[PDB]
Please model this.
Amino acid sequence: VMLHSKNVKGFLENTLKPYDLHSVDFKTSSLQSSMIITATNGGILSYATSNSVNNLKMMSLLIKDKWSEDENDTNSCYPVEIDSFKTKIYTYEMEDLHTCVAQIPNSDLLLLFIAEGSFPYGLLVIKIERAMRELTDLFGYKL
Amino acid sequence: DIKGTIAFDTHGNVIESTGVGSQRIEDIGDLSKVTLDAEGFAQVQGDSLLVHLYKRNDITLAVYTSA
Amino acid sequence: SPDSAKISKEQLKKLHSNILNEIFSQSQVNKPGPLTVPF
Model:
């Protein structure tokens, strides 16, 4: 099995969109970046930006390791279930940026959202959880 | 009138904030410790501003008005 | 818990449902197509 590069890319580009509420006067900026990366090496498989390519590679490996350390050391962590499949969503303050990361269930891949420090974490977590629901094609993806 | 809102989740993380809500994010610590009535409602206040709380589906809504 | 004429329980609840509805609606993302090959 392999990834359809262009469609994954398109999917990530869609995850970028801001929230824009009218019930209350509230609006986020769009995501800084959205990435799918390997849980193993922290290597980037696909990405979308709304800063630079050099900068994303660094952050990705960093969050991979932070995630890896938390995922086996016997912050916020949100246990989630999607169609009986379990994963966990982690938040990490990356300098002035807010990030969420979660393993795509039973896969060797992580989904990573990078947003500005004004993007509320609780909202970021909801965004990534719902996004993950659209990634059933990647559940169990093994390297 | 409504002077502000904050919505937050069960970890105490913010989902959104407007008006004075954005200036009073630190309130969440206290607010999240409020025990709601049987229907999910409460009213508390730190100062001159009244905080109306409603919680459903693991999300608490706080709106600020005057008292 | 008291009701208030500043914002009633009904209004407050309704505003909670609106915020949630908007967020969950705007949380949907379309995939352009299948993400793996072969199909």
Summary: DSSP finds one helix and five strands in chain B. Chain B has one domain: 1-67.
